[PDB]
Each structure stands twice: as C-alpha cells, then as structure tokens.
Amino acid sequence: MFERFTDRARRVVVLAQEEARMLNHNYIGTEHILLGLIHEGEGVAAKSLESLGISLEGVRSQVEEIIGQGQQAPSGHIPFTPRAKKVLELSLREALQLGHNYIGTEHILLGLIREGEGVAAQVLVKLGAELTRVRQQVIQLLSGYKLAAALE
Numbered sequence: 001m002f003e004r005f006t007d008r009a010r011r012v013v014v015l016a017q018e019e020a021r022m023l024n025h026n027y028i029g030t031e032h033i034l035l036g037l038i039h040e041g042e043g044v045a046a047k048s049l050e051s052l053g054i055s056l057e058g059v060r061s062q063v064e065e066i067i068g069q070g071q072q073a074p075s076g077h078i079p080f081t082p083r084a085k086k087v088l089e090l091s092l093r094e095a096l097q098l099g100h101n102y103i104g105t106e107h108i109l110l111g112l113i114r115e116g117e118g119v120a121a122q123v124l125v126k127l128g129a130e131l132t133r134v135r136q137q138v139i140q141l142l143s144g145y146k147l148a149a150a151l152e
C-alpha cells in the first residue's frame with residue numbers, strides 16, 4: 001500500500017516492525033507505529049509532538065510501561081493488527097483532508113490519533129495530542145518550515 005508513502009514515512013513503518021521484534025511481540029500494534037514514529041525522530045510528526053511540549057523519551061516510556069515485553073522474539077515478517085492497519089488507512093484519509101498528495105510521518109501521527117482506541121491514541125490524547133489540535137499544529141509547522149526555508 002506504501003506507494004504514496006514518503007521515504008521518512010516508510011522508514012516509520014519499517015521501524016514499527018523492528019520495535020515489535022526487540023520487545024518480543026509477534027504483532028505490529030498501534031503502539032509499535034507510535035514507537036517507530038518517535039524512533040524516526042526527525043520528521044514533521046516528531047517535531048509536531050515536541051512543538052506541543054511532549055517529551056519523545058516520555059512517550060516511549062509511557063508506551064513500554066503499558067505493553068511490557070513478550071517472552072520470545074519472532075522470526076521474519078511480523079503481522080500488522082487490524083487496528084494498526086486502520087491507522088495506515090486513516091493516514092491516507094488525513095492526507096486527503098489536508099489536500100496533500102503524499103503520506104508523510106505527519107499523516108501517520110494523525111492516523112494514530114484518529115484510530116481512537118489503541119495504546120497509541122490513549123497515550124497521545126492523555127498528553128493533550130487531540131486530533132483537531134494536531135491537524136492544526138501539522139499545517140502550522142509545515143507553513144513555518146516553508147517560510148524558514150524561503151530565507152536560504
């Protein structure tokens with residue numbers, strides 16, 4: 001499905017699989033996409049969360065506290081959960097609502113919040129990372145970057 005994904009956004013979903021592997025989970029949940037997103041660290045999604053005053057280390061610690069560590073590291077491909085698949089479906093819907101013709105890390109963060117049930121949504125809203133607030137923060141951050149770039 002990942003044809004519309006930017007290099008950074010594909011980097012997030014590859015990192016989600018490796019986050020599951022290292023915690024000994026044989027699934028990729030909303031929790032592993034959120035960890036892949038903060039692991040990437042550089043994209044509009046990580047910057048959007050930091051610009052709301054949220055600690056990325058603090059996000060990792062909150063997620064890891066909830067999900068714990070499985071018993072046996074799995075082998076090869078790790079299957080997405082249906083709600084993780086829903087995050088990725090909603091990332092596309094959020095890109096269309098912003099009039100973007102790409103799926104960036106910022107659309108994955110919106111997808112994670114909009115899924116509204118998982119470990120990712122629970123941690124994020126608890127930190128004040130609500131959907132309409134983050135949509136506006138992503139638009140404003142993109143606008144702010146394009147104005148700064150315009151200086152060089």
